[PDB]
Structures are given as C-alpha cells and as structure tokens.
Amino acid sequence: HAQTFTAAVSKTAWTWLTSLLGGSAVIIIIGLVLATIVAMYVLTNQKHN
Amino acid sequence: KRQRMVMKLESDKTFPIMLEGKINGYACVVGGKLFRPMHVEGKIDNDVLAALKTKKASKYDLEYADVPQNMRADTFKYTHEKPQGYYSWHHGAVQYENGRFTVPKGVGAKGDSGRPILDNQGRVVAIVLGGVNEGSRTALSVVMWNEKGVTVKYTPENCEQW
C-alpha cells in the first residue's frame, strides 16, 4: 500500500491536463515575447528619425 | 513675415483652449482633423468644433478628432521637407539644427502649447508642446513627421510642460 503520490496519473489524460496547465503558460509567454517585440519595433520606428 | 504668419493663423480656423476665462493653450486643425494637447484642460473656443468627440493618445499627450469635410475645406497644409535653417511661428522665429528646434530665451511659457511651426510657404512642419530653459535660448519639445509618415516626438531631458 505504498500509494506513491505520482501514481494516480493516466498518461494520455495526464498529458491533456499538462496541456491545460502550463500550455496556457506557454501561450502567454509567447504573447509576452510578441508584445515586447512589438514595443521594441514601435520604439525603433519612433527613434529611427 | 511674422505679420503674414499671424494673418494665416487667424484666417485659418484656430481657437485657444479656454478654461474659467484663462487661455491655457491653443489648438488647430491640420490635414482636416482637430488635434489638442492632452495635458491642456478645457474646451476649444468653437461650439461647432466642441461638438466633435476626441480620442486620447497618452504616449504623446495629444488628442485628435474627426472634422466634418465641409469644415475640412480649409485647414493647415503639412509638408515633410524640413531642411536646416530658420522657421517662423506665433512668437517669432525658431532655429532648426541637429534635428531640434530652439528659440531665444524668454520666448514661450505655460499656455503656449499647440502653436504650430510654419515654413516660408506657410506649411506646418512641427507642433510646439513644451520647452525647457536652455540658458541664452530655450529648446522646445515638438513632434514632427517624416516623408514616410512616422510620428517622432523630440523631448529634451527634464522638459517642462509649457
């Protein structure tokens, strides 16, 4: 009756939940990078002249 | 020249921003749409123009609004040809050098925001928003537009809202 903490996983559904938890984190990291890039482009366009 | 500049500014519909009977700034119509410095509070001195709803642009502390085409009939003419030299505006001449506009000390103060800068042909080349004490002269914080249509705001370090 060891009942290891990480034993109630179900591989496929576990990966589905991994995509549900942290997948949105990856999405928002990509969004943050894109927003930073857009801000840098705006600053470059303004300072260009 | 200054006489002709004032005559052109008056004939073209330009109206100061009145608040409690005090002139706190100026606003003008260029390219057929009204612009107003956001930091200046009050309403344009024109009931017809005051009916227009403005949009805010915090980044440049400026506002803009759509002007009816019939009133777009006669507005300021903008140009992108901004060579080095001297230009004219309401309070006299302005020196343009190194990409910056400078005027002699004692010219310009709180309440002059919104005065455009005109070339020899009477075309707008920049809009005065503020300034900072620069000894024998003062450097104005202005916005200018290149031939590619890029809005560039030149702001001296620690510039005061004039």
Question: What is the structure about, briefly put?
Answer:
Chain A has 49 residues and is mainly α. Chain A has helices at residues 12-20, 23-48. The longest helix of chain A is centred in the last third of the chain and has 26 residues, at 23-48.
Characterization of the model:
The PDB classes it as virus like particle. This is part of a larger assembly, with chains A (about 50 residues) and B (about 160 residues). Chain A has about 50 residues and is mainly α. Chain A has helices spanning about 10-20, 25-49. Chain A contains two helices and no strands. Chain A is rod-shaped and about 70 Å long. Chain B is mainly β. In chain B, about 10% of the residues lie in helices and about 45% in strands. In chain B, strands 7, 8, 9, 10, 11, 12 and 13 form a seven-stranded antiparallel β-sheet that branches. A six-stranded antiparallel β-sheet of chain B has the order 4-1-2-3-6-5. Chain B starts with a helix and ends in an 8-residue tail after the last strand.
